[PDB]
């Protein structure tokens, strides 16, 4: 179930495709937050026309080493 | 089914539900009346 969540978040709330386009400028991000009490400030400019939380689990590197190139595979 | 109704009233489940509902209520209140420092009505 935890793996299912990781792949779904990479597929749905992420900037993985743009990072795939330019890996050394886009910093990876697969979690966005709702604008409830001003907390949307946590949705930062991670590059690629996207605003969220920069992740450090290294999942984009795994998905690139796997051959994954579209969000449909995720 | 009766056993399920009992189980759902055990302490951790009851508190979980109570606080999730309370959280939804306060969240929606603050989404409607944001940034309140005073009682601006009367």
């Amino acid at each position: 179930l935890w793996l299912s969540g990781m792949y779904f978040h990479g597929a749905r709330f992420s900037n993985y495709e743009a990072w795939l386009n330019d890996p050394t400028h886009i910093r990876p991000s697969a979690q966005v937050v709702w604008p409830i009490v001003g907390q949307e400030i946590l949705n930062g400019d991670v590059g690629g026309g996207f605003r969220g939380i920069q992740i450090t689990s290294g999942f984009f590197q795994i998905w690139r080493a796997s051959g994954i190139t579209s969000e449909l595979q995720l | 089914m009766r056993d399920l109704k009992t189980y759902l009233s055990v302490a951790p489940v009851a508190s979980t539900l109570w606080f999730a509902a309370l959280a939804g209520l306060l969240i929606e209140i603050n989404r409607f009346f944001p940034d309140a420092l005073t009682f601006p009505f009367f």
Binding site: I41, L42, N43, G44, D45, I53 | -
Partner: protein, 74 residues
């Protein structure tokens, strides 16, 4: 202690930026060889100097880390 040793050593003598002419500038200046040998160098050049990023994140998208720093101390 293991993770402190690895974190300071990598920034000091491994990580950094290289120029087209080929002159490597490390994140920290390379001060592990001469400041790691005293305890004062660990307190000064590692903890005090690198906690700056987290004690200055209020107002940015890294402010959740500033909140968690203090919560964890608590």
């Amino acid at each position: 202690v293991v993770i402190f040793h690895f974190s300071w050593k990598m920034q000091s003598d491994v990580w950094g930026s290289i120029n087209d002419q080929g002159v490597v500038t490390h994140i920290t200046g390379g001060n592990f060889a001469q400041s790691s040998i005293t305890i004062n160098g660990w307190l000064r050049d590692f903890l005090w100097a690198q906690a700056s990023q987290v004690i200055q994140s209020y107002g940015s998208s890294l402010s959740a880390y500033g909140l968690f720093f203090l919560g964890a101390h608590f």
